[PDB]
Design a protein around this ligand. Structure first.
Ligand SMILES: Nc1ncnc2c1ncn2[C@@H]1O[C@H](COP(=O)(O)OP(=O)(O)OP(=O)(O)O)[C@@H](O)[C@H]1O
Ligand SMILES: Nc1ncnc2c1ncn2[C@@H]1O[C@H](COP(=O)(O)OP(=O)(O)OP(=O)(O)O)[C@@H](O)[C@H]1O
Ligand SMILES: [Mg+2]
Ligand SMILES: [Mg+2]
Ligand SMILES: [Mg+2]
Ligand SMILES: [Mg+2]
Ligand SMILES: [Zn+2]
Ligand SMILES: [Zn+2]
Lengths: 401, 399
């Protein structure tokens, strides 16, 4: 049930000591990663987010200005060029503010929602590293919303709504919500912290979401709503996060022209829905025990012959399913079909299509699933249509399941 | 036609002194980048490439094994953690070999084609930096092909075919090819360099490609075919490249079980088709003067109302085009229609749809282009279909 064991069995990724906490994504794990990006992007479109890309590193001077240097230096990787020191970014917020700061902004531009699949590096103590769930290089499905104070309620509500909308696709039954309050080391006044923490609490109450406080776990610049998911040992992992920030835009000289023609500082909401792709894939792997929903499955269909007699027909069906957009592979090896089926079951391939002479003559396929079910013979075109529907709806459940 | 001025005018990206040579991709520039990735991914499905992702940093010891720490040192960003030294990767090859080395490989797995949109960082001298063309952090449409000696000819041919295939989509008329031979600092024996250089020259001749030698410009591990594209000032920029490598696989302990059941070392072909996304976008921006073909345009369609009476219709049209897969925006601002049209024309939006009362009553739309052509009233579904055909085919010219 451990995602590290399942990841090896399905050849999803590996890690090695030449790059501690750094993931090597193999083809099949990168397929899952990419499908999750496509899913997130479909939500970015619906909820009207920009998508940007900030640089990997920036001058230490800028990280000093935010307060990251004093409050985050231990976790930061640094490098140098031509007598200047750079920080590899542990967070995407300063880069998004650099983009916001190009060009004059008006209240008419707000709320401005700016998303990034943002690569973060944090020098986590090597003793704390754990598979995909705690790594040193990870990719957040991050975004920063620049808004007015009057827009905070609506924008925080929109993030909360987005979290439950995305999580319902995966069928999560245990989502534990925490409000992380001010940490001992922080910037911003007590009055600003009281306001930000109340805003989050009222937003959760308004959505009728039960939660508990988590004292001292907020960011150095603002409080957080945390959406907690659980692994196979029922350990709590922080995934989704909504953060309210009255401090960083001021520190980074962000402003916009208000209705009054006065210069104003935007509020910034930070949020990640999945958290990081790495930690979320870890959670999905354990939650599903490697039985990824068909739309996520690295290989959705394997087509297999009984003998070389049906090998041409298998090759035609494989091209046909591939042209219909299905991740399909042919298994033409000189092995018994029971052997093949057991192997692709261990690989958690949703569907196995067996082609005997009966199947070749009729243009049909015998359908087996990774759950051990025999689904009988079906017409090829009906199978394709059913798989396409299963994939496009991102269905959690297989045919006749 | 300088891509840096166009990039500012169209809000594609920016750069600043807090990160020399590092691009901040804005929404519209990042849209072009992502469409190029979609295009590349479509071609690699066709040619049966895997797609992977390696880590950003690995131990200095690994870069010593490859010979990079000695042949590539001062060009590399280095960092530390818990008394170990790491290199931010300047190339993707060692990571791809690490993935190849996971699990027993046989001749049945070859050729194994492994692609990555590989983020590279190189400490280029700050005085050499230029716009998007020469940056310190960039993304290569990289791949490594592991193959046998007998498979070299076919695999190099496939890379050359891929370059001309993908470049024809953009209509490039000037593609100059170079063969870069052994540099002063290299790994691998002279006989291996003789054979690698001959293999690439034969490949170019067999593909009917006139080329010029570039003595001493090969990679430290092997010679390269370089595909050169030219900017507005006719400066030469290396974009696509094919590199033949008989030495890195052995240094990194790559092997496969041959048909005879003995251990053998694969040959590696390195190749990038576009080169880097940053540099290729720079070239495209100058080549098209910011009039990106519709399939690449950050915003493909803007729909505007003349008065508030049509605002509802414009919103229904906008949702309909967006559901048909078109990058479309509604412009409902309290501005004169002639102000709105000019704004989106200057932003080089391919198609502008104007809705007055007669368009609403008829279920039609008045269509004009960024070049000033007035297409008149058209049926909505006719516009969507023509737009979809222009995008699906990645057509260079409009309606
Ligand atoms: N080391 C890490 N490995 C993997 N994912 C991470 C890591 N650190 C953070 N994330 C993910 O990024 C999200 C947003 O980042 P944030 O700065 O809020 O995390 P965090 O509070 O430091 O997390 P944690 O308490 O788990 O260390 C987290 O909710 C988590 O999903
Ligand atoms: N500093 C850079 N900025 C942008 N793109 C680059 C840069 N260096 C290399 N590339 C791109 O990556 C491709 C493959 O990398 P490779 O190591 O072969 O380049 P290169 O020979 O060092 O390039 P150049 O001669 O332009 O310095 C190049 O052909 C080019 O398109
Ligand atoms: Mg942390
Ligand atoms: Mg935390
Ligand atoms: Mg170079
Ligand atoms: Mg060169
Ligand atoms: Zn942030
Ligand atoms: Zn390489």
């Amino acid at each position: 049930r451990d995602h590290r064991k399942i990841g090896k069995q399905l050849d999803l990724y590996h890690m090695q000591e030449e790059a501690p906490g750094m993931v090597f994504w193999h083809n099949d794990g990168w397929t899952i990663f990419r499908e999750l990006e496509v899913f997130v992007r479909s939500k970015l479109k619906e909820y009207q987010y920009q998508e940007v890309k900030g640089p990997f590193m920036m001058d230490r001077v800028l990280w000093e200005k935010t307060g990251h240097w004093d409050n985050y230096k231990d976790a930061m990787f640094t490098t140098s060029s031509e007598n200047r020191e750079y920080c590899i970014k542990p967070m995407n917020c300063p880069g998004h503010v650099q983009i916001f700061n190009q060009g004059l902004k008006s209240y008419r531009d707000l709320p401005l929602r700016m998303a990034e699949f943002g690569s973060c590096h944090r020098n986590e103590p090597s003793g704390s590293l754990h598979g995909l769930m705690r790594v040193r290089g990870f990719t957040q499905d991050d975004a920063h919303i620049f808004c007015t104070e009057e827009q905070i309620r609506d924008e925080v509500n929109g993030c909360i709504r987005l979290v439950y909308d995305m999580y319902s696709t995966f069928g999560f039954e245990k989502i534990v919500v925490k409000l992380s309050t001010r940490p001992e080391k922080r910037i911003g006044s007590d009055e600003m912290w009281d306001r930000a923490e109340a805003d989050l609490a009222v937003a959760l109450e308004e959505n009728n979401i039960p939660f508990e406080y988590q004292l001292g776990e907020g960011a150095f610049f603002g409080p957080k709503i945390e959406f907690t998911l659980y692994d196979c040992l029922d350990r709590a992992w922080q995934c989704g996060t909504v953060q309210l920030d009255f401090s960083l835009p001021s520190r980074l000289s962000a402003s916009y022209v208000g209705e009054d023609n006065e210069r104003k500082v935007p509020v910034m909401i930070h949020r990640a829905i999945l958290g990081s792709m790495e930690r979320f894939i870890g959670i999905l792997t354990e939650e599903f025990a490697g039985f990824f929903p068909t739309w996520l499955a690295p290989v959705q269909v394997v087509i297999m012959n009984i003998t070389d007699s049906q090998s041409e027909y298998v090759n035609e069906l494989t091209q046909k399913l591939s042209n219909a957009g299905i991740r399909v592979k042919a298994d033409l090896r000189n092995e018994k079909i029971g052997f093949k089926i057991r192997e692709h079951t261990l690989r958690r391939v949703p569907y196995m299509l067996v082609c005997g002479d009966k199947e070749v003559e009729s243009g049909k396929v015998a359908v087996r699933t990774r759950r051990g079910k025999d689904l009988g013979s079906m017409d090829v075109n009906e199978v394709i249509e059913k798989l396409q529907q299963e994939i496009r709806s991102r269905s959690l459940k297989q045919l006749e399941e």
